[PDB]
Amino acid sequence: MVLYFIGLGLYDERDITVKGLEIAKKCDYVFAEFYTSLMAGTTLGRIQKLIGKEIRVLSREDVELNFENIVLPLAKENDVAFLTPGDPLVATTHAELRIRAKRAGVESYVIHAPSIYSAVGITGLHIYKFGKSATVAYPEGNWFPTSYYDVIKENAERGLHTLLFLDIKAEKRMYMTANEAMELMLKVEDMKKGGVFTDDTLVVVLARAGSLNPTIRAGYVKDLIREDFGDPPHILIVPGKLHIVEAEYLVEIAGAPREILRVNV
Amino acid sequence: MVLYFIGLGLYDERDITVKGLEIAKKCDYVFAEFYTSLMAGTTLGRIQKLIGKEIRVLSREDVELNFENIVLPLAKENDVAFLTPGDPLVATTHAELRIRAKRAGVESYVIHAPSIYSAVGITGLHIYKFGKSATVAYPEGNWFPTSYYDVIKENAERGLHTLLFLDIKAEKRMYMTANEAMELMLKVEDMKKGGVFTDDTLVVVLARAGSLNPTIRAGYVKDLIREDFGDPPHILIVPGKLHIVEAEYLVEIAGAPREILRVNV
Ligand SMILES: Nc1ncnc2c1ncn2[C@@H]1O[C@H](CSCC[C@H](N)C(=O)O)[C@@H](O)[C@H]1O
Numbered sequence: 001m002v003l004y005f006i007g008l009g010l011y012d013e014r015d016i017t018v019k020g021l022e023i024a025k026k027c028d029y030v031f032a033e034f035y036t037s038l039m040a041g042t043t044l045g046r047i048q049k050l051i052g053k054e055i056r057v058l059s060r061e062d063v064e065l066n067f068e069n070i071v072l073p074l075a076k077e078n079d080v081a082f083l084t085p086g087d088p089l090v091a092t093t094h095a096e097l098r099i100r101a102k103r104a105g106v107e108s109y110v111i112h113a114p115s116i117y118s119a120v121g122i123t124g125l126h127i128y129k130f131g132k133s134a135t136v137a138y139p140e141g142n143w144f145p146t147s148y149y150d151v152i153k154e155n156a157e158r159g160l161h162t163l164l165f166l167d168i169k170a171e172k173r174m175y176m177t178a179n180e181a182m183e184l185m186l187k188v189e190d191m192k193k194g195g196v197f198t199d200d201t202l203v204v205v206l207a208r209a210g211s212l213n214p215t216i217r218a219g220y221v222k223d224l225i226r227e228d229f230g231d232p233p234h235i236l237i238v239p240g241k242l243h244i245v246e247a248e249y250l251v252e253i254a255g256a257p258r259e260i261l262r263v264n265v
Numbered sequence: 266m267v268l269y270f271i272g273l274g275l276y277d278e279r280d281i282t283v284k285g286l287e288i289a290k291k292c293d294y295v296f297a298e299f300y301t302s303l304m305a306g307t308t309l310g311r312i313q314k315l316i317g318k319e320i321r322v323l324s325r326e327d328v329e330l331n332f333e334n335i336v337l338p339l340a341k342e343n344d345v346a347f348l349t350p351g352d353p354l355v356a357t358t359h360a361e362l363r364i365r366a367k368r369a370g371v372e373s374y375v376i377h378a379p380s381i382y383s384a385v386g387i388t389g390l391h392i393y394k395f396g397k398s399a400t401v402a403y404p405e406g407n408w409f410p411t412s413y414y415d416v417i418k419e420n421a422e423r424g425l426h427t428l429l430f431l432d433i434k435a436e437k438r439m440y441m442t443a444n445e446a447m448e449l450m451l452k453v454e455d456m457k458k459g460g461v462f463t464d465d466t467l468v469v470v471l472a473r474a475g476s477l478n479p480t481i482r483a484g485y486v487k488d489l490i491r492e493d494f495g496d497p498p499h500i501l502i503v504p505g506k507l508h509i510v511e512a513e514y515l516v517e518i519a520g521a522p523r524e525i526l527r528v529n530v
């Protein structure tokens with residue numbers, strides 16, 4: 001009578017950990033959600049085939065409003081697994097679901113999986129140098145989100161890198177590209193005029209981490225804003241002051257302009 | 266002609282991903298390092314048995330000084346794997362190993378795995394709220410480093426959480442315990458008297474992340490400094506002001522005192 005939160009990883013069904021797979025194969029019921037992120041390299045069918053179980057996919061409403069009515073009941077008498085893209089607790093509100101499990105007298109366990117939060121290391125940017133993170137959300141009607149602007153500002157001032165999660169509207173199959181993120185951000189800069197994010201700002205784009213050939217690009221906004229980085233998901237990063245070896249990596253591996261090698265210490 | 270950087274994950278031999286295992290099994294040569302960290306929940310023998318390949322262990326010097334003459338030559342005519350605890354490229358000097366590969370006309374691919382950077386999400390603390398990260402090191406001779414103290418200060422000051430890695434002596438398999446870290450920091454607070462780390466400071470301890478039964482504890486230093494957190498590795502976190510949901514998780518899941526619901530929110 002336990003509930004397992006099992007992450008599926010970054011790109012395809014093989015990004016699940018061996019631990020996660022062996023446990024998932026032995027659960028009586030398997031649920032999952034695919035709205036918190038996009039696993040561009042697999043399909044529900046492939047996942048099901050891999051674990052050898054039928055997977056009942058849940059919507060944001062099913063989870064957020066009815067988790068304790070749909071999932072928890074079965075966990076009281078069976079072994080249940082709840083699958084999610086990446087790591088189940090990273091940049092989601094899934095952690096709170098563990099509190100619901102407890103209140104319903106259901107023991108829960110967490111099986112991690114590779115997350116975009118650590119995969120940023122493939123950009124060559126020292127991970128310990130990342131500051132507060134943020135999300136670039138799509139404007140809705142008259143509401144235009146801007147919180148991410150001050151986060152970048154705050155981190156840049158301290159010389160820290162900023163990781164920017166990009167928006168996703170799964171039910172509409174909408175996945176924000178780095179290009180769309182940059183356009184929205186330039187519009188905010190136009191309004192705030194803080195010099196935080198401009199055409200001369202160096203940025204890094206990581207697309208489809210987890211795949212064997214992810215797209216890793218670094219350069220100035222003016223040059224990258226219209227570049228094609230391939231299919232989603234995309235993640236955007238605004239570096240802070242660079243170490244010599246970070247700049248070297250960005251140039252040698254991410255195709256950045258050789259001029260970023262010259263750091264302004 | 267190919268070099269694979271493969272992450273081993275968090276704690277035991279099952280923490281590698283299905284993708285990492287299958288690729289490792291097809292490699293002609295397999296190297297690994299355990300100087301950046303150890304896999305406390307398993308052994309070299311178990312990892313070797315699971316992968317079914319002899320694993321050549323490399324020291325810090327083998328990697329930093331001679332990676333290109335030990336690993337890369339073999340990668341020119343074979344498929345070589347380089348295993349590391351956690352997620353590849355998280356250790357700050359590992360990213361530059363890919364530059365070395367390029368220079369040697371060797372292709373390299375990264376296979377991700379769970380990292381403590383993302384696994385800490387199991388503490389219920391929102392990942393976007395983490396700021397700069399640091400490592401707590403032991404004073405030595407006339408050297409008394411305290412940089413991590415300023416990091417905690419700069420983060421908390423902005424409402425951000427601080428992830429603290431504890432000093433480790435891989436070769437000797439000597440880990441700094443959370444208890445030792447706290448004592449060291451109270452000592453640092455006594456010298457800088459900045460009111461950053463005191464008996465009243467709230468902290469979180471994560472031990473054996475990755476195992477099915479990790480130790481997750483939260484509370485004030487005065488009560489946790491002498492508490493037994495079990496076998497290493499221990500990870501320490503000094504949270505910034507908490508979101509009521511984070512605090513509730515720490516109370517319900519990590520045994521934190523009710524008091525945090527009004528004092529640290
Ligand atoms: N493989 C990938 N490549 C690039 N960005 C990714 C990604 N996976 C997730 N993201 C980014 O993160 C957003 C989802 S946020 C949820 C993250 C997830 N729990 C994890 O552990 O990774 C996406 O909209 C995208 O901006």
Ligand code: NA
Nearest residue numbers: 130395396398
């Ligand atoms: Na971080």
